[PDB]
Amino acid sequence: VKNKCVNFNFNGLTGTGVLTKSNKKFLPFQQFGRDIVDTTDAVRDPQT
């Protein structure tokens, strides 16, 4: 469910927040996302 605050457990990464589509350029090996503050920003869907 996108565009709705929701607790997520993506591949064992527990948290809460709003998910949506992105136009990122994830390289094939890339799995996670972060920022200069080192906090999980984008998580690739295991099943999509």
Binding site: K24, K25, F26, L27, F29, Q30, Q31, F32, G33, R34, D35, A42
Partner: peptide, 24 residues
Amino acid sequence: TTTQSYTNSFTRGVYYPDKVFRSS
């Protein structure tokens, strides 16, 4: 056979330490 000449590597041999997308 083979030779063992020495050269310089310059800026080379840098790999993604992990699999976390990062930008800017």
